[PDB]
Write a structure and sequence with these properties.
It is classed as proton transport. Keywords: proton transport. This is part of a larger assembly, with chains A (52 residues), B (109 residues) and C (54 residues). Chain A has 52 residues and is mostly helical. Chain A is 96% helix and 0% strand. Chain A is rod-shaped. Chain B has one domain. In chain B, 30% of the residues lie in helices and 22% in strands. Chain B has a 4-stranded antiparallel sheet, with helices on one face. In chain B, a hairpin with a 3-residue loop joins strand 2 and strand 3. Chain C has 54 residues and is mainly alpha-helical. The radius of gyration of chain C is 24 Å and the shape is rod-shaped. The termini of chain C are far apart. Classes of the chains: A mainly alpha (52), B alpha+beta (109), C mainly alpha (54).
């Protein structure tokens, strides 16, 4: 009984690790490239006005 | 040294979340460590307690636990008169040390 | 027994790191071309200022 519950609590320590191992880069790099693609708005808006 | 008593099945690989330490337990405290192996640290396996080798005074056992919970298990076992002997990938280097023990006798000859 | 189910459930967590790269793989790739969809915001700027040239 207790040998299975500590196994079942280890599955919970996998699940709280899995939430930490699926949301860190998925929230950071989604905000990293929004600066980078926002820079791709800014880097073009210098030259595309300069052709005008 | 455990260059001949080493076994890959006696240890738990993939040390990202689980690792089996070679825990030495005395013959008098063999039953007391068997009822306290689950309570030595958090997230430790309560069914991995199994004697790897045995001596006349003490008994060597394996204890699987978490990667960050090895220090909490070794601290409570040192208060519970148990010793935790580390085992790593240098057992393959200890197999070359037995060849170096043969190379020492070859160089002496 | 407990030791063999721990590794395959670790592969479940090792399958959600493949989602932790995927949601920064597809999202990096889809809106990189949406940054190239702002060329159409320039294509309307040239053709409407083609009128002020005209």
């Amino acid at each position: 009984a207790d040998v299975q519950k500590q196994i079942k609590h280890m599955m919970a320590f996998i699940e709280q690790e899995a939430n930490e191992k699926a949301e860190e880069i998925d929230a950071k790099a989604e905000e990293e490239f929004n600066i980078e693609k926002g820079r791709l708005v800014q880097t073009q808006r210098l030259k595309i006005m300069e052709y005008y | 040294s455990l260059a001949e008593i080493v076994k890959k099945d006696d240890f738990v690989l993939d040390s990202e979340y689980l690792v089996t330490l070679l825990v030495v337990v005395p013959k008098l405290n063999h039953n007391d460590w068997i009822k306290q192996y689950e309570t030595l640290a958090e997230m430790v396996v309560p069914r991995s307690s199994n004697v790897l080798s045995e001596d006349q005074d003490s008994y060597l056992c394996n204890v699987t636990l978490f990667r960050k919970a090895v220090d909490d298990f070794r601290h409570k076992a040192r208060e519970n008169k148990f010793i935790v002997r580390d085992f790593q990938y240098n057992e393959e280097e200890m197999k070359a040390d037995k060849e170096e023990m043969n190379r020492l006798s070859t160089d002496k000859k | 027994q407990g030791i063999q189910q721990l590794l395959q459930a670790e592969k479940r967590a090792a399958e959600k790191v493949a989602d932790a790269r995927k949601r920064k793989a597809r999202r990096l790739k889809q809106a990189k071309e949406e940054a190239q969809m702002e060329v159409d915001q320039y294509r309307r700027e040239r053709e409407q200022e083609f009128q002020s040239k005209q």
